[PDB]
C-alpha cells in the first residue's frame, strides 16, 4: 500500500493514523507525481469508513470544462449534451471518503458550491433543486501554497479554513531519500505483477545511482526511470538513465 | 452570549439598546469573527424573539442566485426559473432577516435593496405584485462602508439608511480576554458528537494561543482547537504558522 | 416647511413666486439635503395644489425601467413588458410631477424628455399615440448641469428649459440656522411614529450639533438624531465621530 | 421677424431674393439663435408660401428614428415598424421642408438624402416604390460645414448642393440692436397664454440685457425673460444672469 | 463638353480615339471637374453611340447596396432581397457603362469586376447563371491608382486592364481658359429652363471668377454662378465669400 | 510565344524533361509574367497532353470561394450550397491541374491540398465519400516559398511535396529577348478581333520597348502595346510609360 | 530498416528492446527524418506483429478534425456529424496506434488522451459507452518536450507516460553514414514505380550529397534525389542546391 522509511515519511504516517480515526477534512500538500494518491487510500483504510467506498477524482484532468458536472452529478438537459441523469461523484461516496485531487484548480463559484456541500452535508444536482443528505468524509490535495493562493484572490478563504484543520505536507523525493529504494522497489514489483513478470532486484551500485539524484519529477519520474531500466532489462544494473 | 471581554461586553450592551426598537443594524469587523451570534443576540432580546430568524450570506451565493434568492421569482423569471419560489424577505415576515457581507451586493442589487427598505414592500422577480413587509433587517460587512461609498461601489442613500446603529466588532488579537472562553466554547461544541470535552486546554496552551494575533481571527482560532483535539484529547502543544 | 436661516426663508420667498406660475422648477443642492420638503411645499403653494403629486427618483430605479416607468409602456414593447402600464406623466395629469435627480438621465432619454416638454404630450413606449398632458414639472440635481452641458453629458436645449428658474439648496453646514428646529423637528416624528412624549436636547447636545459640519447634510443629521433616541430618550451625548 | 440691426436686414432682404427662387438654402450660425423664422419667413416669401411647411430635428429625433422619420417606412422594414407611414418628405409635398442640424446626420444617411436631392424622389424604408417629389429644401447646421467636410465628417458632393445660397445668422451679441425687440416679442408671446404684457421697461433692464454677451443667445433670453417675469410682473431691473 | 485652353482640347481629341474603338477608359482627375459628361461624349461618339449608355457612382451607394446594383441578385440572395432585379451591366447590354468612383470598390468586389471583365460575363447575386455581355466599360477615380495599388487597396491585374487609357482631366486652375466658356454654359443652360439668358456678365467679374484658383472646381463654379443668378440678373459682383 | 531568350529557352529545356514525367512543378517568378505559357507548355508536352488543362486562380476568386470550387461540395454542405457542384480536380482526371498563385492558400486549405497530393483522392465539402484521382499537379508563386514556410505561413510539408522540380521564370527586364516576340504575338492575338495585324512596330519602338524595366512585366507590355494600337496604326513612338 | 551509420544502428538495437515490451515509445528527431520506417519497425519487430498498424498524424488533420479522428463520433456529437464513426483507437484494437507530432495536440485533448492512457479505454464524441482498448502506442514530436512541458502547453503527466523510452532520430548531418544507402533506395524505390528501368550512381555526386549538411534532411534529400532522376536517367553529377 504505502511502504516507507524516512522517520520523516514515518511521522507523517502517524499523523495520518490520528486523523484517520476521526472524520476531519484532510489537506494534502506536496507536489504532484509524489505519492499522494497511496496517503489518501491509507487515512481511508485506517478510518472507521475503510469498508465503505473510496472514491477519487483529479480535478486537474477533468476534460470538455465536466469537473462540476462530475461532483454534484445532474438532471437531464441541466445543460447541453446532458442527454441523461447522472449522480455524482460525492453520491457515489456515500458513507465512504472522497479524494479531492488537485483542488486548488476549481474556479471560485465551483469552490462556493463546495463551501455549501461542506456546511450543509448535502448536495444538489445541477438543474435540480432537491438536496441529497450526505455522510461522506473529504480528503484533498494541492501542490499549491492555498493560503498564498487565497491571498491572490483565487480561493476562497472559508473554504481554506474549512480544507485546512489538519494539513500534512508530503515532502519532495530528494528530503526523503531514505524512501528512495522501497519505493523503487515498489514500482517494479507493481510494474512486473501487472505484466505477469517475475520482479527483479536493483544492484547496489544502480541503488547509489538512484539516490544522489535530485528527482525533479519527483515519484512519477522514478517510476519512468526505473519501468526504463526494466526494459534495458531484468535484474538492474546502472541501466538507470536520468539525463544521459 | 459567550464573551468575556471589556470591549465586548460593552457592545452587548449597546446590543440590547438597539434591539429593543426596529432600526436597521449594521455588523463591521473582520469576517469569521463571530458576528452571526451577535446578531442572532439582537434578535433575541428584541420583541420580535419569537419570530423566524432568517439569515444569507451574499458573498456565499453561487451561480449568481442572490437575487433570486433575496426577492423570491416566479416561474420562467429567468433562464432556469422553472418553479416559483418565495424569497428571504417573506421568510422572515414577522422576523429577522441578517444580511451577511452586504458589501458584495452589486449596484443594481443595492438600488433593489433600497426599495425594500423605502417601502417595506417586494416584488419577486417576473412579478408586478408587491409583498407587503414586515422585517427588521440586519446587515454585516467587512470593509468599510463609507469608503466603499466614496469609491462609487456602494450607494449613499443605501449606506445611511443601513448606518443609524453600526456596530463594530474588534479582531480577535483586540479582544484578547475573548480567546480562553471562545476556545472552551469551540471546543465543547465540536466534541458534541460522543466527545468527552476535554477541559480548557493546559494552561501552556492558552497562553500559547494568547500571544498569537489571530490574522484569521474566530475562524482561525477553530481549526486550531480542531486540530489541537485531533492531535489529541486535553491538549499541549499544537500548531500554528510557525510550526517548527 | 421647518426653517429659520435667512438663507432659506429668502429661498422658500422665491419659491412661493414660482408656485404661483406654471415654470419648470430646478432644485440644485447636495442629496438628502431634504429639498424634497421644497417640491412638495412648492406644490402645495401652487394653484395644482389639489391635483397628484408624482415623484421619482431617476437614480434609483432598478433594471433599466426609468424610461419605461416615466412614459408608460404597450404589453410586448420591450423584454418583460407583460401588461400595458401608464407612466408617470398619466399619473400626474392635472398635478405636478417631481423628476428627482434628473442629472442621470441618458441622452436619449433626455430627447425624449425635451419633446414631451415642448409638445406637452407624451407616447408609451411601443405606441405611436400621443397623450395631451397638463403636467407641472419640478426636478433636482445635486450636479451643476451647466458644466454637465459643457461635458456633453447634458442636453443645452432641455437645460435651458429646466432652468428658467433654479433654486439651489444649501448645505447644512451654510444655514446653521436651521440645524436644530430640524433635529427637533425629526425627534418629533420619529416619537410620533411610536406615541410617547417628547425628549429634550441638553444645551451641550446643541452646541454639539451646531459645531459639526454635517458633510452628509440632512441624512446625516438624522442617522444622529435616530441614533441618540435609542442611546436613549433625553439628548445628552449622542454622537458622529468616537474618535 | 421681428429684427431691427442693419446686420440682420441686410440677411432678410437677402433671404427675399433666395425666396423668390426654388434654391436650396443653408442657414449658419449657432444653435438657439433663431434660424427656425428665417427658414419660416423664407417660406412665406417664397412661391410655395401657400403649401405645407415642414420641419425636422436633426439633433433631437429619439430612437435613432431619424432616417425613418425623414424617409418613412412600410410595416416591417425594422423592428418595430407595424405599420407604414409617411415620411417627412411626402407630408411637404409642394412646400418646403426645413432640415435642421443637418450636420448631425451619419454619412449613410446623407448618401440617401444626395439621392433624394438628385432625383427628387424619395422610397420608404423596406420599399422600393420612388415616390417623385416636388419639395423646397432648407437645412441648418450650428457647425462649419466646409471643416466638416474636410473632417471626414460630411459629403463633399451634399455639401456643394446645399450650400448654393448660405447665409449666416449672426449670434445675438453681434447684432445687439435686435436684443430689445427680440425681448419684447419673446415677454408678450409668454404672456400670450393668459397674462397681460408687461413692458421691460426702461434700460436698467434695457441695457443690463444689452451689455451681457448672451453665450447661449436667444434660448438664453427667452430663459433669462421668462425669469423675469416669474420674479415678477409689470416692473424690471431683476434681469438674472450672473449673481 | 464645352472647352478651350488647347490642354482640354487635346483630351478631347484623345477621347476621340479611344471612342472609335472597345477599350476601357479611366478618366482621372478631381470630383466634380466635368468628368461626368466626357464620358458620355465617349459613348456618343463610338459605334455603341445609339445603345444604352448606364451610369453608377460606386461612392454614392447606400447601404452597401453598390455589389448588389452592379450585378443584380435573385430573391433571396441577401436579407432584404425580395425580389429578382437586374444588375446595371445588364442594363448597359449592347451599350457602355460608367463606373464613376471606382477606387471606392473593396478588394472583393474588385476581384468580381475582373473576372467580369476577363469572361465577359456576369452573374447575378445569389444564383450561378452567368449571363454573356457586351459592354463597353468608361471608369473614373479621383485618386492615383498605382499608388493605390502599391498601398494594397486596389488589385494590381485590375488596374492593368483598366488602364489601358487614361486620361487626365485637369483642375480648373489649370486650365483657366475653360472658365468663361463654362461659366456661361452654367448660366445658358439653367436660363434656358426659365427665360431669357442674362449674361452680359461684366468683365469684371469674368476677371474676377478667372483668377480664383477653384479649390473646388466646377462644382464650385456651378455654386458661384448660380448664386450669382440669384443676386440678380446680369452678373456684376458675386461672392467667394464676401471676400476671402 | 515563340520565345527567343537564351534564358528562356534553357528552362524551356528544363520543362521538356520533367514534362516526360508526372512530377510536381512549381513555377516560381513574378506574377503577370507569362507563367501560363510555361505551365500549358509542361502540359501539351506531357504524356497527358491530350487530357483536360484545368487551371485556378487562388489570388482571383470572390466570396471566399477557393475551397469550394477545388474540392467540389454537396447541397448544404455550407450557407448558399443549394447545389451538388464537382471540384477542379475532378474535371481534371487524366490531365493536369495549374494552382495558379498557390502561396494565397490559408493554411487549413494547404493542409486538405497536402492529403489530396498523397492520397491521390479527394473529398467533396460536406462529403465523406473519396475519389480517387489520377491528376498531374502544376503550381505557381510569386512568393520564395522557403521564405514563406519560415514565416510560418505554408506548411514545410506541402513545401517539399511541391518542391521536386523549381523553375523560375524570369522577370521580362531578365529575358530582354523576349521583349519584342512577345510585343509582336500581344499585338497579333489582339488584333484577332477583325482589326488587321498591324506591322511589327517600327525599330525605333522595339528600342524603346527594349530600354524600359517592366517593373508590371507581360501585364505591363501587354498594356503599353494596346495602348499604342489606340494611337492608331502601325506603332512608332506611339509607346507610352510615364510620358 | 535502412541504415549504416553506428549512431543509427545502436537506435535500431535500443528499437529492438523496446519492441518487444507494450511500453509507449517517443521518437524524437526532425520531423522529415525517417520516423515512419521506425515506427513501423518497431510494430514488426513486437508480440502485435500480425495485428493493425494506424498512423495519424496530429499536424495534419484539417477542419478541427483531430479530435473526431482519433476518438471517433456519435451521429449528432458536433456539427456536421452526420453519421457515426469509429476513431483511430478502435481501428487498432489488438495492434498499434503512431500518433506522430503529437505536441501539436491541445491541451483539453491532451487531458482526453491521458484518461484513454491511464484507464485503457475510449469513448466516442458524444456517448457515454467506454471501448475497452489493447493497443500499443507511438508517439511523435520534433520538439523538445520537456521544456513544451516548462512552457506550460504540455501537461506534465501525461509527457511523462510518453516517455518512459525516447529515441532520438539525429538529423541527417549527424549520421552522414547513412546518406549514401538512403539516396540509393530512394532510387531503387522510384524506378521500381515507372517501367522498371535501371538505376546507377556516380562518385563525384555522393561526395556533393556527402557534403551537404541537409537542414532539411530526408525530405530534402529525396527532392533531390528525384529531381537528379529527372534531370536523367543514369549516371550524375546533376545533383541541385546551388
Given at each position: 500500500?504505502?511502504?516507507?522509511?524516512?522517520?520523516?515519511?514515518?511521522?507523517?504516517?502517524?499523523?495520518?493514523?490520528?486523523?484517520?480515526?476521526?472524520?476531519?477534512?484532510?489537506?494534502?500538500?506536496?507536489?504532484?507525481?509524489?505519492?499522494?494518491?497511496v496517503?489518501?487510500?491509507?487515512?481511508?483504510?485506517?478510518?472507521?469508513?475503510?469498508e465503505?467506498?473510496?472514491?477519487?477524482?483529479?480535478?486537474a484532468?477533468?476534460?470538455?470544462?465536466?469537473?462540476?458536472?462530475?461532483?454534484?452529478?445532474?438532471?437531464?438537459?441541466?445543460?447541453?449534451?446532458?442527454?441523461?441523469?447522472?449522480?455524482?461523484?460525492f453520491?457515489?461516496?456515500?458513507?465512504?471518503?472522497?479524494?479531492?485531487?488537485?483542488?486548488?484548480?476549481?474556479?471560485?463559484?465551483?469552490?462556493a458550491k463546495?463551501?455549501?456541500?461542506?456546511?450543509?452535508?448535502?448536495?444538489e444536482?445541477?438543474?435540480?433543486?432537491?438536496?441529497?443528505?450526505?455522510?461522506?468524509?473529504?480528503?484533498?490535495?494541492?501542490?499549491?501554497?492555498?493560503?498564498?493562493?487565497?491571498?491572490?484572490?483565487?480561493?476562497?478563504?472559508?473554504?481554506?479554513?474549512?480544507?485546512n484543520?489538519?494539513?500534512?505536507?508530503?515532502?519532495?523525493?530528494?528530503?526523503?531519500k531514505?524512501?528512495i529504494?522501497?519505493?523503487?522497489?515498489?514500482?517494479?514489483?507493481?510494474?512486473c505483477?501487472?505484466?505477469?513478470?517475475?520482479?527483479?532486484?536493483?544492484?547496489?551500485?544502480?541503488?547509489?545511482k538512484?539516490?544522489n539524484?535530485?528527482?525533479?519529477?519527483?515519484?512519477?519520474?522514478?517510476?519512468?526511470?526505473?519501468?526504463?531500466?526494466?526494459?534495458?532489462?531484468?535484474?538492474?544494473?546502472?541501466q538507470?538513465?536520468?539525463?544521459?
Amino acid at each position: 500500500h504505502m511502504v516507507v522509511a524516512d522517520t520523516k515519511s514515518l511521522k507523517l504516517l502517524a499523523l495520518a493514523d490520528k486523523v484517520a480515526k476521526t472524520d476531519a477534512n484532510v489537506m494534502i500538500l506536496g507536489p504532484s507525481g509524489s505519492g499522494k494518491e497511496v496517503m489518501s487510500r491509507y487515512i481511508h483504510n485506517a478510518s472507521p469508513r475503510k469498508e465503505g467506498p473510496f472514491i477519487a477524482i483529479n480535478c486537474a484532468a477533468i476534460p470538455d470544462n465536466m469537473l462540476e458536472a462530475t461532483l454534484f452529478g445532474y438532471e437531464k438537459g441541466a445543460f447541453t449534451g446532458a442527454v441523461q441523469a447522472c449522480p455524482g461523484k460525492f453520491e457515489q461516496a456515500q458513507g465512504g471518503t472522497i479524494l479531492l485531487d488537485e483542488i486548488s484548480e476549481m474556479d471560485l463559484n465551483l469552490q462556493a458550491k463546495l463551501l455549501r456541500v461542506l456546511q450543509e452535508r448535502e448536495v444538489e444536482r445541477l438543474g435540480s433543486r432537491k438536496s441529497i443528505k450526505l455522510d461522506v468524509r473529504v480528503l484533498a490535495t494541492s501542490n499549491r501554497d492555498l493560503k498564498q493562493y487565497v491571498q491572490a484572490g483565487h480561493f476562497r478563504e472559508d473554504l481554506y479554513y474549512r480544507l485546512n484543520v489538519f494539513p500534512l505536507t508530503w515532502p519532495a523525493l530528494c528530503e526523503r531519500k531514505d524512501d528512495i529504494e522501497p519505493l523503487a522497489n515498489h514500482l517494479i514489483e507493481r510494474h512486473c505483477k501487472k505484466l505477469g513478470l517475475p520482479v527483479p532486484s536493483i544492484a547496489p551500485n544502480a541503488i547509489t545511482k538512484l539516490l544522489n539524484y535530485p528527482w525533479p519529477g519527483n515519484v512519477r519520474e522514478l517510476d519512468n526511470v526505473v519501468q526504463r531500466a526494466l526494459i534495458l532489462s531484468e535484474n538492474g544494473h546502472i541501466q538507470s538513465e536520468h539525463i544521459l
